[PDB]
Amino acid sequence: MSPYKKAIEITKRLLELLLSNPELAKKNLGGIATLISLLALISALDGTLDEKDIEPYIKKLEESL
Amino acid sequence: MSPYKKAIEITKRLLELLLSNPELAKKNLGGIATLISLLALISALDGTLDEKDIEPYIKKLEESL
Amino acid sequence: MSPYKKAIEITKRLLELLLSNPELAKKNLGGIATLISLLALISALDGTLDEKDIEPYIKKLEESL
Amino acid sequence: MSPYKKAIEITKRLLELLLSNPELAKKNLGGIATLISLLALISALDGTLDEKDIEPYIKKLEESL
């Protein structure tokens, strides 16, 4: 478990928490977006960035607009 | 191709989402700001930071106050 | 001494500020989450990420919903 | 102007914008805190983290609670 891999898992857990309730998601759009950016940054630091792993979250965010 | 370049494109996509609607942008100013900071950080990690690539977003933020 | 260690201490201070008041924490869930992600990122940059150092904050976040 | 130094200046500009109006600051506490964390992280990446440069912002945030 590389440190970056642990940080990815944590950030994905945080995204699921904030998106779990759409009413809570719509009041925290900026934070969800910032988490998605952080997930990409950490992934690129780990050298395992795959766009397919990020797009589901972007599409969920878009639906919550 | 670079993983940082993919993360830059994702972060700009997220900024466009949050700025698309002036009313949603005024409700998420801190999130837009944190995304502009991240865009700058990721750009510096990628070696390529041109201020001219950030400033448009900063002026858009200033517009929403 | 390490600059990353100072940034870890600052980020934990900010998390304690935002969590001190349950009412302010429920209004800033996305910010608490993004700080927990950053704490993990910075820890991974410093080489030292122990999940046990992050989990208390995650459970506190889950408490505020 | 090293890329990290440009990112520091941008992040400090963003902090001043969000803190410029206390009424706007109190609605964006989480984003201000996340910006302060990012300022520390970027500073440590540049190898120029001085706690004295960060504390003024933390004290302003505390006053806005």
Author numbering:
A (entry chain B), B (entry chain A), C (entry chain A), D (entry chain B): 4 to 68
What did the publication describing this PDB structure actually write?
Here we use deep network hallucination to generate a wide range of symmetric protein homo-oligomers given only a specification of the number of protomers and the protomer length. Starting from only a choice of chain length L and oligomer valency N (2 for a dimer, 3 for a trimer, etc.), the method carries out a Monte Carlo search in sequence space starting from a random sequence. The loss function guiding the search is computed by inputting N copies of the sequence into the AlphaFold2 (AF2) network, and combining structure prediction confidence metrics (pLDDT; per-residue structural accuracy, and pTM; an estimate of the TM-score) with a measure of cyclic symmetry (the standard deviation of the distances between the center of mass of adjacent protomers within the predicted structure). To eliminate such over-fitting, we generated new sequences for the HAL backbones using the recently developed ProteinMPNN sequence design neural network (accompanying manuscript: Dauparas et al.).
To evaluate design accuracy we attempted crystallization of 19 designs and succeeded in solving crystal structures for seven (three C2s, two C3s and two C4s). All crystal structures had the correct oligomerization state and closely matched the design models (median Cα RMSD of 0.6 Å across all designs, with resolutions ranging from 1.8 to 3.4 Å). The side chain conformations in the crystal structures also closely match those of the design models. HALC4_136 is composed of 3-helix protomers with eight outer helices encasing four almost fully hydrophobic inner helices, where two of the helices are rigidly linked through a 90° helical kink. The closest match in the PDB has a TM-score of 0.71, but the matched structure has C5 symmetry rather than the C4 symmetry of the design and crystal structure.
